[PDB]
mmCIF file of C-alpha atoms in Angstrom:
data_model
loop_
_atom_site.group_PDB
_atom_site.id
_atom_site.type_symbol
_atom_site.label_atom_id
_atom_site.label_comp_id
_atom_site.label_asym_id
_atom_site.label_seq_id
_atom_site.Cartn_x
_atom_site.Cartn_y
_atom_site.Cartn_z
ATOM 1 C CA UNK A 1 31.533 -8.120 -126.711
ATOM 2 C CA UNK A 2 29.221 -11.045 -127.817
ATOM 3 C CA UNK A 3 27.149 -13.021 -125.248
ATOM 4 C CA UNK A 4 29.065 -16.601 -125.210
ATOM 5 C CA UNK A 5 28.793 -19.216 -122.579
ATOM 6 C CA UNK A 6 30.399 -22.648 -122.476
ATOM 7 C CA UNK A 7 29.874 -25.765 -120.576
ATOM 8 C CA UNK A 8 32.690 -28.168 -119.964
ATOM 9 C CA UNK A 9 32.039 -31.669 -118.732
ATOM 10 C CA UNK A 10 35.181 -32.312 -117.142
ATOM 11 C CA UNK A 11 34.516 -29.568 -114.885
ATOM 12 C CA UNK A 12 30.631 -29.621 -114.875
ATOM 13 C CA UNK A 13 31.462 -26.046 -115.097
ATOM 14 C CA UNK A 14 29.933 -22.888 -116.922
ATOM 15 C CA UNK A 15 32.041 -20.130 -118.153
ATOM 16 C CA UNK A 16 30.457 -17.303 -119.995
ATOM 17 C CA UNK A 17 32.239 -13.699 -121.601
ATOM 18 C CA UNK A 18 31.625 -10.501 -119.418
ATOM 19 C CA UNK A 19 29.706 -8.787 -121.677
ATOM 20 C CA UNK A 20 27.222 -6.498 -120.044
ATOM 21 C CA UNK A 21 24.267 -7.209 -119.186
ATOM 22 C CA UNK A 22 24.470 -10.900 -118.998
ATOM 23 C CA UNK A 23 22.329 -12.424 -122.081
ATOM 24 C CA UNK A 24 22.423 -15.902 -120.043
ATOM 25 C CA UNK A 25 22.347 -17.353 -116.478
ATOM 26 C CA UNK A 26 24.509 -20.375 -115.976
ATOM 27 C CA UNK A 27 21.946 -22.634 -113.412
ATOM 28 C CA UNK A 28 23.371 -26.337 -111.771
ATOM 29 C CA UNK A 29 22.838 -29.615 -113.158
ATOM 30 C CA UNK A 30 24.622 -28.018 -116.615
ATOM 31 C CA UNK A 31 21.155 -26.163 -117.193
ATOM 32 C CA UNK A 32 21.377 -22.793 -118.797
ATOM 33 C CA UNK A 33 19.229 -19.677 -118.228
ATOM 34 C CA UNK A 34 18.224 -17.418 -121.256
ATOM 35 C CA UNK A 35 17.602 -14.247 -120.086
ATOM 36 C CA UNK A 36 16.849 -11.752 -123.279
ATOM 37 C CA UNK A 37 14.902 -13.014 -125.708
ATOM 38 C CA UNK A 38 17.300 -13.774 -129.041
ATOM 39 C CA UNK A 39 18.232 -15.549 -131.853
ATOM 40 C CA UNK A 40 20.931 -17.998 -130.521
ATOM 41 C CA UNK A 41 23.041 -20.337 -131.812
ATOM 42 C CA UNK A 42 24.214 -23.455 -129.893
ATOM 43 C CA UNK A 43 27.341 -25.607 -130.706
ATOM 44 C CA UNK A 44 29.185 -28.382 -129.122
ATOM 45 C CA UNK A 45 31.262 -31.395 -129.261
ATOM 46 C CA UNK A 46 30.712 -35.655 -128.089
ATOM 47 C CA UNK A 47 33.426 -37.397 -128.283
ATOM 48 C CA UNK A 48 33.214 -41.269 -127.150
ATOM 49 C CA UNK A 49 35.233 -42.897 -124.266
ATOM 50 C CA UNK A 50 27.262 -45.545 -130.131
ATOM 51 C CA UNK A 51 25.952 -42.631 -127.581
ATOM 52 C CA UNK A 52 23.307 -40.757 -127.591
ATOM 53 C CA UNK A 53 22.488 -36.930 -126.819
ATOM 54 C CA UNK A 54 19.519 -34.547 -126.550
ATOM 55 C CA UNK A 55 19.446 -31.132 -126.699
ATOM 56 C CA UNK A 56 16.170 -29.720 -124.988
ATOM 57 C CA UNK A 57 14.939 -26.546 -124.519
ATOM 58 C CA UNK A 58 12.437 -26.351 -121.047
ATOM 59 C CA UNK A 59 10.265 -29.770 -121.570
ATOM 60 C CA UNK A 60 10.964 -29.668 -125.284
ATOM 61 C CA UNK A 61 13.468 -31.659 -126.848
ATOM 62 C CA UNK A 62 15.505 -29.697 -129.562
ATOM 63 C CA UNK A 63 17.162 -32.283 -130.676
ATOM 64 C CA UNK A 64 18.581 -36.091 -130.851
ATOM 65 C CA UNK A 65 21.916 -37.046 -131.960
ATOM 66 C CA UNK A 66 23.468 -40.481 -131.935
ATOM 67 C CA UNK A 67 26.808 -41.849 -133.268
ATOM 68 C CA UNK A 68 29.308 -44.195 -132.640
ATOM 69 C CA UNK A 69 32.304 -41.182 -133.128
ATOM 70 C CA UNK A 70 32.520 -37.784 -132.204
ATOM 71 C CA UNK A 71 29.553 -35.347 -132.920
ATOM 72 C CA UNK A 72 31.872 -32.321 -133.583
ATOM 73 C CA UNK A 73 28.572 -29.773 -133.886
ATOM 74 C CA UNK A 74 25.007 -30.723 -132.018
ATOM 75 C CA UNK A 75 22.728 -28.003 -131.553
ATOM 76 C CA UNK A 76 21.672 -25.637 -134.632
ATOM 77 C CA UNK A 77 19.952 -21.963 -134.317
ATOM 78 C CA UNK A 78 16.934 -20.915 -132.277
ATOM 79 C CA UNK A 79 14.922 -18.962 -131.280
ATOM 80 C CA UNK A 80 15.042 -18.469 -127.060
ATOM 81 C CA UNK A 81 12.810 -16.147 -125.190
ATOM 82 C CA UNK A 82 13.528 -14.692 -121.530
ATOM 83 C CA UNK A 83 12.947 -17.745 -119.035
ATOM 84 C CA UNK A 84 13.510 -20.332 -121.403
ATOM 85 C CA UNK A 85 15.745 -23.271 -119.401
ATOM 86 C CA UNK A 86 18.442 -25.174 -121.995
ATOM 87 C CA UNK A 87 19.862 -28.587 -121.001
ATOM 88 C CA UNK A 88 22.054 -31.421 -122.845
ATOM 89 C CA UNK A 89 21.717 -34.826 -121.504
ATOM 90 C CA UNK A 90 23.450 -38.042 -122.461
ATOM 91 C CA UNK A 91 21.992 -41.133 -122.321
ATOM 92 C CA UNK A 92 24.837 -42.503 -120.452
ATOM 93 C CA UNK A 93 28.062 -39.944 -119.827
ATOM 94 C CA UNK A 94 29.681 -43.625 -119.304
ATOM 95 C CA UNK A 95 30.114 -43.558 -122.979
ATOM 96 C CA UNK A 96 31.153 -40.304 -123.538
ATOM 97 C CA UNK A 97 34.950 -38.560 -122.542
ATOM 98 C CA UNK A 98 34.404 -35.936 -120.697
ATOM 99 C CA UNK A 99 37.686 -34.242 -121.551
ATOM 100 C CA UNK A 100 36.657 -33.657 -124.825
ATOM 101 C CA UNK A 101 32.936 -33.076 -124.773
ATOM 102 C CA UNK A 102 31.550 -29.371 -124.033
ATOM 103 C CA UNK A 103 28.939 -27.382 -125.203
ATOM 104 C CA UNK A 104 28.195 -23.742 -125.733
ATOM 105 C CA UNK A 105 25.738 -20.753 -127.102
ATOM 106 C CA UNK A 106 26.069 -17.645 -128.764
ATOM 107 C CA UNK A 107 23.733 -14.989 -129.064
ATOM 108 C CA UNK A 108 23.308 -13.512 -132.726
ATOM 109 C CA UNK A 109 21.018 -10.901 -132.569
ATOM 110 C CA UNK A 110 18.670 -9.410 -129.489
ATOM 111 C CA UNK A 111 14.253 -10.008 -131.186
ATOM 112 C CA UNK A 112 13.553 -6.177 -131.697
ATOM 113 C CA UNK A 113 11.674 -6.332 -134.935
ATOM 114 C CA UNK A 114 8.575 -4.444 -137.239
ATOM 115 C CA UNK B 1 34.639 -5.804 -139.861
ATOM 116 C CA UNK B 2 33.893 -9.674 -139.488
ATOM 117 C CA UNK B 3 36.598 -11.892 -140.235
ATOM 118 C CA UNK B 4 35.826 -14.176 -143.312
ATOM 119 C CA UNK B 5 37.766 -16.357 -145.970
ATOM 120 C CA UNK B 6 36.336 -17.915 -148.727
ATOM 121 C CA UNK B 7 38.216 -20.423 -151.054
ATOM 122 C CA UNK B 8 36.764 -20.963 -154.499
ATOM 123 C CA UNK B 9 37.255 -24.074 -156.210
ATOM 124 C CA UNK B 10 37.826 -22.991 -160.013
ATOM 125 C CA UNK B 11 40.447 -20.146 -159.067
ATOM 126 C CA UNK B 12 41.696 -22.915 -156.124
ATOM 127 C CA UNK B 13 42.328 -19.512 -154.475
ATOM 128 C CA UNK B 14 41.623 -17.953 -151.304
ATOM 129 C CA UNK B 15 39.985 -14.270 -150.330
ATOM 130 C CA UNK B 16 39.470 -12.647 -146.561
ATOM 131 C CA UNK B 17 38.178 -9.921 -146.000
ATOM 132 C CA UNK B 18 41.048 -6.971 -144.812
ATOM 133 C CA UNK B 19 39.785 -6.661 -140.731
ATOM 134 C CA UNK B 20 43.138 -6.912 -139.232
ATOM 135 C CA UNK B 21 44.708 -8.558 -137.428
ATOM 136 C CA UNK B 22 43.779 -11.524 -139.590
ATOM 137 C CA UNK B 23 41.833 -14.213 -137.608
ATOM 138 C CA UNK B 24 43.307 -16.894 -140.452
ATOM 139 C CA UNK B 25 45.812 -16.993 -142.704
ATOM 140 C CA UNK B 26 45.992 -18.774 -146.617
ATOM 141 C CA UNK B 27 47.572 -21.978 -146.969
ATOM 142 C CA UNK B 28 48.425 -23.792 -150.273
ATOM 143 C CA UNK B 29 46.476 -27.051 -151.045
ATOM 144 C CA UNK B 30 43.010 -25.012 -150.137
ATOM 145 C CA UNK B 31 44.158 -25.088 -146.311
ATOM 146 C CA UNK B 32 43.305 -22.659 -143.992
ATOM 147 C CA UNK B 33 45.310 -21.663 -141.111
ATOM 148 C CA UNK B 34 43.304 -20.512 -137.882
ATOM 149 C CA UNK B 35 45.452 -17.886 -135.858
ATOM 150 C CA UNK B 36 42.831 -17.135 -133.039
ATOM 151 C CA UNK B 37 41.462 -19.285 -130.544
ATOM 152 C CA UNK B 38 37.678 -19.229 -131.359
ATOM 153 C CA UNK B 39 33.970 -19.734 -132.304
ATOM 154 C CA UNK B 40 34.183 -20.200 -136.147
ATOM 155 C CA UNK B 41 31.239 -21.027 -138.623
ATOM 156 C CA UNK B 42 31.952 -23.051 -141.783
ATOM 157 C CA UNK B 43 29.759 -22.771 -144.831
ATOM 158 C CA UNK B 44 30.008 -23.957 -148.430
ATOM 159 C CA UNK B 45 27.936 -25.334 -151.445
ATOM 160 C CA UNK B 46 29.059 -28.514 -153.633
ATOM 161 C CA UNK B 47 27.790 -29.190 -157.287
ATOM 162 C CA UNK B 48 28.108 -31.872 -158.597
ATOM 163 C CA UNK B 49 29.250 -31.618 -162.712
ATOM 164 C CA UNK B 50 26.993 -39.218 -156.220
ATOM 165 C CA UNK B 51 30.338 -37.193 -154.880
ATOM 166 C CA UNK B 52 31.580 -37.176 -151.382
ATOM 167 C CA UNK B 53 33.256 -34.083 -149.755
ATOM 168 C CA UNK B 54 34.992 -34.391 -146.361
ATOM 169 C CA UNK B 55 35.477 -30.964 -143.943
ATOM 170 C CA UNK B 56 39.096 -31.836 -141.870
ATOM 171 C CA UNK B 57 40.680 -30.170 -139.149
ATOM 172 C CA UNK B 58 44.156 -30.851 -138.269
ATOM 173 C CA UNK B 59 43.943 -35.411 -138.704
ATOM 174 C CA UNK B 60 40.439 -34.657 -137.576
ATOM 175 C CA UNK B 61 37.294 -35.607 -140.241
ATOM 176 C CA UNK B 62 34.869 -33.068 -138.701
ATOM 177 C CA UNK B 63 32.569 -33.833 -141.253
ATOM 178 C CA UNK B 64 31.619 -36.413 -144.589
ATOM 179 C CA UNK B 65 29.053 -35.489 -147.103
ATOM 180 C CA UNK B 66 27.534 -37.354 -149.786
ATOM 181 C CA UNK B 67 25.280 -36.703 -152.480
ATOM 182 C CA UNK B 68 23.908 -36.929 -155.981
ATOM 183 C CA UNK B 69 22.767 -33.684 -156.292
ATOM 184 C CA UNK B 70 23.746 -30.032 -154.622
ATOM 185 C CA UNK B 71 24.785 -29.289 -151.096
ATOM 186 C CA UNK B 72 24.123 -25.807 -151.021
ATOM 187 C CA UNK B 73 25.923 -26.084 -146.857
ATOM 188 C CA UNK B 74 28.462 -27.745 -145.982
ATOM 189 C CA UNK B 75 29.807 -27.419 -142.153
ATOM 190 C CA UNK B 76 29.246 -26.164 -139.026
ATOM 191 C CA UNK B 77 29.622 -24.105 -136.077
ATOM 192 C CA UNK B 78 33.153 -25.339 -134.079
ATOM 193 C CA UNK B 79 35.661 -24.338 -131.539
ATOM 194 C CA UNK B 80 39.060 -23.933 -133.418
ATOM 195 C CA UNK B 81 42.578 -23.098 -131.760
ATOM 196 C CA UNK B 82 45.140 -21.134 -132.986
ATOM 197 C CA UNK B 83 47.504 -23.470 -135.150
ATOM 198 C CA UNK B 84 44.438 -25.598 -136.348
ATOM 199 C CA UNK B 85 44.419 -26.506 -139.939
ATOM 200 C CA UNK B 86 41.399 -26.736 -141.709
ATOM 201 C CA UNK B 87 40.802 -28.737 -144.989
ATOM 202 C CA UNK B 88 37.729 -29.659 -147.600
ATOM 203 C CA UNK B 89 38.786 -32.624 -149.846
ATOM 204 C CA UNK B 90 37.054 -34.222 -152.435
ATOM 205 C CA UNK B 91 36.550 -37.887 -152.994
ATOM 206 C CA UNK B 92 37.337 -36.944 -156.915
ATOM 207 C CA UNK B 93 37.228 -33.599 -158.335
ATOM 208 C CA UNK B 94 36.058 -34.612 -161.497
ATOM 209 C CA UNK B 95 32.812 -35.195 -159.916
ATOM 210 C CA UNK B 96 32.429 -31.613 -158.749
ATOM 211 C CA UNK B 97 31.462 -28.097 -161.023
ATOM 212 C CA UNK B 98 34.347 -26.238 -159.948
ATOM 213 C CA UNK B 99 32.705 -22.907 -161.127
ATOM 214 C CA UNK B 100 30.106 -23.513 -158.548
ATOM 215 C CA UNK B 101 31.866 -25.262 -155.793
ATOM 216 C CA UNK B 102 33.542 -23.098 -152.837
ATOM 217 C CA UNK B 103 33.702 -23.447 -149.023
ATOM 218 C CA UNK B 104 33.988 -20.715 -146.635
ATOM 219 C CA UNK B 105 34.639 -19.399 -142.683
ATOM 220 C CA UNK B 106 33.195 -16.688 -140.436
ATOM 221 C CA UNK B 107 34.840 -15.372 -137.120
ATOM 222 C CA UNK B 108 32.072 -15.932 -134.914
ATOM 223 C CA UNK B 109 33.354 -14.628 -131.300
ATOM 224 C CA UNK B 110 36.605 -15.298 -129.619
ATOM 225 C CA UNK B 111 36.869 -17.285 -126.959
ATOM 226 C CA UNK B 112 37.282 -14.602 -123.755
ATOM 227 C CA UNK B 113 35.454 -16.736 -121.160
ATOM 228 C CA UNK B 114 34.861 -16.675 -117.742
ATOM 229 C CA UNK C 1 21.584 -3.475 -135.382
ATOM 230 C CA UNK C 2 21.857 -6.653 -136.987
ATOM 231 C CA UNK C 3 20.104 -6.891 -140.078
ATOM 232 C CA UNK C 4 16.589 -10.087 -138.874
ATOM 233 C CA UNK C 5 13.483 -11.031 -140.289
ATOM 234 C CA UNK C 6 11.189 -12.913 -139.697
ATOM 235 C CA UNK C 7 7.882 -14.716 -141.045
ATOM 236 C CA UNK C 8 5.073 -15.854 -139.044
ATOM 237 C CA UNK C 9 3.003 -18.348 -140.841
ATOM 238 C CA UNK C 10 -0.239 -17.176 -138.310
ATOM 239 C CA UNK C 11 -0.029 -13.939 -139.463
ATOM 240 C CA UNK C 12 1.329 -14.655 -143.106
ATOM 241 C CA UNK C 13 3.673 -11.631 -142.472
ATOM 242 C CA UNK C 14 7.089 -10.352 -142.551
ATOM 243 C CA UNK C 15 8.952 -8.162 -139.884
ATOM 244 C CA UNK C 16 12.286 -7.221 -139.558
ATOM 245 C CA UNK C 17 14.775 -5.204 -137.666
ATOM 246 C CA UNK C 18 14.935 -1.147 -137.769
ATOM 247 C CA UNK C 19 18.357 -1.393 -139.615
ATOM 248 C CA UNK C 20 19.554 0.784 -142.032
ATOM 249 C CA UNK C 21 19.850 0.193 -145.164
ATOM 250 C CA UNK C 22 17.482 -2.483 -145.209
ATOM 251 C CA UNK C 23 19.752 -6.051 -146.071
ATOM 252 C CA UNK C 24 16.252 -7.782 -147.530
ATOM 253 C CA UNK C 25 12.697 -6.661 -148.284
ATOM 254 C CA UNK C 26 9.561 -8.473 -147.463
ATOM 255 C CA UNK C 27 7.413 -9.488 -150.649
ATOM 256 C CA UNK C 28 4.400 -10.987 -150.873
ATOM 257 C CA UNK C 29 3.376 -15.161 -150.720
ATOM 258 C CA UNK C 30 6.132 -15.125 -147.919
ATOM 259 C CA UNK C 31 9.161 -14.330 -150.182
ATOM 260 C CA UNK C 32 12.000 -12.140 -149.336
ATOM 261 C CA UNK C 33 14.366 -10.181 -151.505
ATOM 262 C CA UNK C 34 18.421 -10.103 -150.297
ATOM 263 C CA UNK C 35 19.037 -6.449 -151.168
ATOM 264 C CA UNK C 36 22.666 -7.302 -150.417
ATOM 265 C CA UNK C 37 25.659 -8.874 -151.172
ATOM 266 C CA UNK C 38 26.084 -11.479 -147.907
ATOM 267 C CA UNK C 39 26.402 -14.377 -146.242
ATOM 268 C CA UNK C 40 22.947 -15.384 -144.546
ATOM 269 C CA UNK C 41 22.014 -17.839 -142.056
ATOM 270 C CA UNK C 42 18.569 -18.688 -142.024
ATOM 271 C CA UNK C 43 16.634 -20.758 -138.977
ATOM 272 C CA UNK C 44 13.311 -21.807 -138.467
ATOM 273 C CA UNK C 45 11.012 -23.988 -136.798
ATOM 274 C CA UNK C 46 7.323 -25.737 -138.060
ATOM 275 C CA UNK C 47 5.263 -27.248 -136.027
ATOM 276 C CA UNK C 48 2.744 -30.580 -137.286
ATOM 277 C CA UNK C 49 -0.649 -29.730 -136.241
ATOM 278 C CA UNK C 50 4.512 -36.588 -141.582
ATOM 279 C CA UNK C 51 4.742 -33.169 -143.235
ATOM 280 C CA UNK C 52 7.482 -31.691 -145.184
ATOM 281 C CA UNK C 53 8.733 -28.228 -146.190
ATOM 282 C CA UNK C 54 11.219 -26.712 -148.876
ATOM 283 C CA UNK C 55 13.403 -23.529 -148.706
ATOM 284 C CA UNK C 56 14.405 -22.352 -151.648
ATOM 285 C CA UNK C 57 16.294 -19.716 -153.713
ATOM 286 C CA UNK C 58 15.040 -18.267 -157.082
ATOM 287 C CA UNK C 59 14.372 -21.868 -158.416
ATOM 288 C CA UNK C 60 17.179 -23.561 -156.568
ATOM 289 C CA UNK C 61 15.789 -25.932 -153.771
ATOM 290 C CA UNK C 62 18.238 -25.572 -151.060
ATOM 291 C CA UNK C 63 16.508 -27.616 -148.836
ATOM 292 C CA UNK C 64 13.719 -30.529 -148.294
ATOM 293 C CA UNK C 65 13.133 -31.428 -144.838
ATOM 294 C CA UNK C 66 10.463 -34.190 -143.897
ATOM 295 C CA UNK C 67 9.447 -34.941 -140.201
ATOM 296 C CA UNK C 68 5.958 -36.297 -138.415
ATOM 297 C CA UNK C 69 7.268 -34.156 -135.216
ATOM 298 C CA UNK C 70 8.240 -30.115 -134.599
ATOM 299 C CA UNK C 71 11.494 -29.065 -136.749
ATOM 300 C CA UNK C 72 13.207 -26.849 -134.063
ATOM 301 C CA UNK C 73 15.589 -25.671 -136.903
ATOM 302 C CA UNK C 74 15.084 -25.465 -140.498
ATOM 303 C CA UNK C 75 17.438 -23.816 -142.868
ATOM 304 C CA UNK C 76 21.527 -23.190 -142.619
ATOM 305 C CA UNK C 77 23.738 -20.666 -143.761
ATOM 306 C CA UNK C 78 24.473 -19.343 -147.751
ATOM 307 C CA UNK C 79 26.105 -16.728 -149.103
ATOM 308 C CA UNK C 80 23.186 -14.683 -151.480
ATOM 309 C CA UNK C 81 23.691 -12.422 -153.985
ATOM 310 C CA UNK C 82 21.418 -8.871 -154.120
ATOM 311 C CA UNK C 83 18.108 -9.976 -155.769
ATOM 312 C CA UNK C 84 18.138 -13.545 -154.798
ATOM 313 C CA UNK C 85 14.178 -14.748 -153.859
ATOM 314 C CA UNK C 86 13.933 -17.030 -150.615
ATOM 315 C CA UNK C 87 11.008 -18.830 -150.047
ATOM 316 C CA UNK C 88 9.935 -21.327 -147.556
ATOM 317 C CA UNK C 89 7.112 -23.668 -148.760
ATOM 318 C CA UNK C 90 4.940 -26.455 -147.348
ATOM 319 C CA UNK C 91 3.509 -29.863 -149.138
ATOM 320 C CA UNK C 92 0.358 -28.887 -147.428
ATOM 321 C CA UNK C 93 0.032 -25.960 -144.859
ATOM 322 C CA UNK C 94 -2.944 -28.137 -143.254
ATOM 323 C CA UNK C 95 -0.443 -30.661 -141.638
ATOM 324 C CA UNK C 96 1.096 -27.553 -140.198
ATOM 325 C CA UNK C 97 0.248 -25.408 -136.941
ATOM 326 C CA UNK C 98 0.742 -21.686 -138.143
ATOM 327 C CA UNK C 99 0.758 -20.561 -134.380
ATOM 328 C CA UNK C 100 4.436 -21.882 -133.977
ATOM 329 C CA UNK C 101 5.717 -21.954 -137.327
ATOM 330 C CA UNK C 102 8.074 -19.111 -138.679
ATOM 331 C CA UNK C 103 11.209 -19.088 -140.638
ATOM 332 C CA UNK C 104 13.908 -16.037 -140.562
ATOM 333 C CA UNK C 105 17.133 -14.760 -142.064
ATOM 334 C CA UNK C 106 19.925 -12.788 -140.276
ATOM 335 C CA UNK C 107 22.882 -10.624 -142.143
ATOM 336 C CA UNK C 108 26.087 -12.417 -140.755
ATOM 337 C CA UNK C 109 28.877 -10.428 -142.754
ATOM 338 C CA UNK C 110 28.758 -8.483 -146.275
ATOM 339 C CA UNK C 111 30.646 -9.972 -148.790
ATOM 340 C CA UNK C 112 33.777 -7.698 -149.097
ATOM 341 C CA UNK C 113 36.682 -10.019 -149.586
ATOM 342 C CA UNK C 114 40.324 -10.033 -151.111
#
């Protein structure tokens, strides 16, 4: 089973597959724990009630998106290592509906290389 | 075996892999039809023979392109539901190298979540 | 195993995951051959020490990217064909810090369709 998580915004709520072990912690404040070091990829959807998001990973930030309509993919592929914390913050959820905005991460392949 | 379709432009055809059951089905008009709920990743390359391409789901525009030269990727990574019909249209065909022009879709992971 | 490699600009060097048959092979000047048949997603991130960097294939420029800040993903996803060359390349390596710079490649699905 592949390690998925996904974080609604209506709910404020984490929900993550059962695969075995856990490749991700969900943490409060829609923070995520990485927990195996791995190429991940992270997806998600804005969609207005222009906004702004960020994507950050620990103090870094990932990335910046800004529109006017939906963002129907932030995020992009990375490389996470065990500890790492990942967050998505808006600059005002005011803006955005919550209904329809969620974000998630999938984990492509575990580091083990040369 | 992964699920994947890929629709080339100069046959206007479709091809998917044979893991059954199908996670998509062939529609006419270079639709796709997406019979599981799940994580799906879009790819594609446009050459030109500027052109602008638009990626659609359902009355959705997920995404609009434009350029003068190449895209060697089109799309995304997006959550798709079972009935959801996805499109790429051209702003004129005429503009576009069929023989090097096709779009495609990987099966990710379903969506078993918490 | 998933088929992964990856380049580190510190150590000019290729390594990759333990799987059999090898889906690429590392060559030298920080190329890498596809061996197979696939669809590839490659990712990436370069650090400034406004630089810019190009990933290509064969001759084809797939990409350009410019930025005066980290790029926390570089590349996207293509199908290549066995032989293909990818190559990542910078305007100047000087405007670059090598110590968190590295670009990869990971085997999402053969090409085995219709």
């Amino acid at each position: 089973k592949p390690c998925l998580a996904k974080f609604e915004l209506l709910t404020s709520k984490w929900q993550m597959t059962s695969r075995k072990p856990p490749c991700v912690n969900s943490l409060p404040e829609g923070k995520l724990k990485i927990l195996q070091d791995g190429l991940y990829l992270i997806y998600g959807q804005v969609a207005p009630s222009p906004f702004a998001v960020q994507l950050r990973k620990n103090e870094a930030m990932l990335q910046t998106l800004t529109s006017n309509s939906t963002i129907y993919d932030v995020g992009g592929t990375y490389e996470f290592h065990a500890g790492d914390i990942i967050d998505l913050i808006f600059d005002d959820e005011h803006q955005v509906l919550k209904n329809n905005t969620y974000w998630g991460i999938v984990l492509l392949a575990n580091l083990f290389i040369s």
